[PDB]
Amino acid sequence: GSHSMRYFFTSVSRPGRGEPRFIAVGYVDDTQFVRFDSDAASQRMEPRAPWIEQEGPEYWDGETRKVKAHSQTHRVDLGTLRGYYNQSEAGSHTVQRMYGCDVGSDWRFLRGYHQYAYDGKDYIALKEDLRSWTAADMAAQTTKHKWEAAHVAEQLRAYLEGTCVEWLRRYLENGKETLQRTDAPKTHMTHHAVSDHEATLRCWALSFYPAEITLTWQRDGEDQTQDTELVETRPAGDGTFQKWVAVVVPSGQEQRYTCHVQHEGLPKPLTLRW
Amino acid sequence: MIQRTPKIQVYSRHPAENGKSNFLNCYVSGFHPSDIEVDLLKNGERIEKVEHSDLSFSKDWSFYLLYYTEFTPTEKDEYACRVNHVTLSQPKIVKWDRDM
Amino acid sequence: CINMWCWTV
């Protein structure tokens, strides 16, 4: 089993008046555990999972200092990139950053990563080997040399293979009641007559965790994609997820069709009939 | 300046039963930029108790948010999700259907 | 536990 800790930053310039809006959220796998929001009163990194409140005042003081620093780096960035891209001061613009680390089944560092976007487009990302950068354009080529020169990668590497993974292990342990618990989907099937000749079969997966899931219809033991609808996975809003898939079939023929569920919470795939 | 239209899903946290307290979700996703206006409605009239998740984004950089409120399904009552974005000429209203 | 991020673009 691999697990991930990830951090997602967003800054939207507010030209006309003020500093940019800065929202920062942290996740372990599919669980959010911290947030910061420049519009909030506290001006503090805030807890969003029960198991992180375990952490002392000095954690919240450490995290807050670091994340206000990050909002300032994004503030400079927005201005630097307005100029790189020869944009006016009139318009609103966005920077987005994501970084994180994974551990493997050995509980050891498995993976690291870091990506940057300007107005919704790649700008610069760290390479998988964590020694070097990938610039999307000639602007980003300026940033790459600056960061090469500053030895940013080596310091980012030290963090992701160290501090990041260490604290990941910490959170997994502290919140194992939920972070290390898999909820298998609660499945069922519904049937609706659209006419006298035809009917809709809808296969539901409710209340599962993680979010990763596979739902497919088979007819007489072969996959069927024709005449189906498959909604995107959606949060229930209690930390679990939902999904469904539907097929349109001739009335009286429902027995040919099986729904097939794949999920980590299940040791063996599930098969459902009418 | 990339401009992606929001995907919308309107649904309930738990299997709908008439007369039993539930929650109504609007999951708006795949949009850019982050600026968006989401309302939940009961018989056209806007609902005030509404809360939302903290802004986040997927690998492809497109945003996503969940808007929710406590509610109770009934026989006659209609519930919808109203969404406005810069990519929409007028607000797009999605109706809640309990079998989806 | 976040990084200390102080490099600008």
CATH superfamily of the largest domain in chain A: MHC class I-like antigen recognition-like
- CATH topology descriptor of chain B: Immunoglobulin-like
Radius of gyration of chain B: 14 Å
Largest interface, C-beta within 8 A = A-B, 32 and 29 residues
How large a portion of the residues of chain B is in β-strands, by DSSP E? over 45%
How much helix is in the residues of chain A? 10-25%
Summarize the main sheet of chain A.
Answer: 8 strands, antiparallel
| Structural category of chain A | alpha+beta
Would you spell out the secondary-structure blueprint of this structure?
The complex is a heterotrimer of chains A (274), B (100) and C (9).
Chain A: E1 3-12, E2 21-28, E3 31-37, E4 46-47, H1 57-84, E5 94-103, E6 109-118, E7 121-126, E8 133-135, H2 138-149, H3 152-160, H4 163-174, H5 176-179, E9 186-193, E10 198-208, E11 214-219, E12 222-223, E13 228-230, E14 234-235, E15 241-250, E16 257-262, E17 270-272
Antiparallel strand pairs in A: 1-2, 1-5, 2-3, 3-4, 5-6, 6-7, 7-8, 9-10, 10-15, 11-12, 11-16, 13-15, 14-15, 16-17
Chain B: E1 7-12, E2 22-31, E3 37-42, E4 45-46, E5 51-52, E6 56-57, E7 63-71, E8 79-84, E9 92-95
Antiparallel strand pairs in B: 1-2, 2-7, 3-4, 3-8, 5-7, 6-7, 8-9
Chain C: no helix or strand
Disulfide bonds (chain B): 26-81
Organism (chain B): Homo sapiens (Human)
GO molecular function (chain B): identical protein binding; MHC class II protein complex binding; peptide antigen binding; protein homodimerization activity; structural molecule activity
Give an account of the 3D structure.
The PDB classes it as immune system. The entry lists the keywords MHC class I, HLA, immune response, nonapeptide, viral peptide, hepatitis C virus. It forms a trimeric assembly. The entry is titled "Crystal Structure of MHC class I HLA-A2 molecule complexed with HCV NS3-1073-1081 nonapeptide G4M-V5W variant". The complex is a heterotrimer of chains A (274), B (100) and C (9). Chain A folds into 2 domains: 1-181, MHC class I-like antigen recognition-like (Murine Class I Major Histocompatibility Complex, H2-DB, Chain A, domain 1), CATH 3.30.500.10; 182-270, Immunoglobulins (Immunoglobulin-like). Helices cover 24% and strands 39% of the residues of chain A. Chain A has helices spanning 57-84, 138-149, 152-160, 163-174, 176-179; strands at 3-12, 21-28, 31-37, 46-47, 94-103, 109-118, 121-126, 133-135, 186-193, 198-208, 214-219, 222-223, 228-230, 234-235, 241-250, 257-262, 270-272. In chain A, the strands form 3 sheets. Chain A has an 8-stranded antiparallel β-sheet with strand order 4-3-2-1-5-6-7-8. In chain A, strands 9, 10, 13, 14 and 15 form a 5-stranded antiparallel β-sheet that branches. In chain A, strands 12-11-16-17 form a 4-stranded antiparallel β-sheet, with no helix packed on it. Chain A is globular and about 70 Å long. By secondary structure, chain B is mostly beta strands. Chain B has a single domain, classed as Sandwich (Immunoglobulin-like), CATH 2.60.40.10. Helix content of chain B is 0%, strand content 47%. Chain B is built from no helices and 9 strands. In chain B, the strands form 2 sheets. In chain B, strands 1, 2, 5, 6 and 7 form a 5-stranded antiparallel β-sheet that branches. Chain B has a 4-stranded antiparallel β-sheet with strand order 4-3-8-9, with no helix packed on it. Chain B is elongated. By secondary structure, chain C is mostly loops. The chains are: A alpha+beta (274), B mainly beta (100), C little secondary structure (9). Chains in contact: A-B, A-C. At the A-B interface, strand 1, strand 2, strand 3, strand 5 and strand 14 of A face strand 1, strand 2, strand 6 and strand 7 of B.
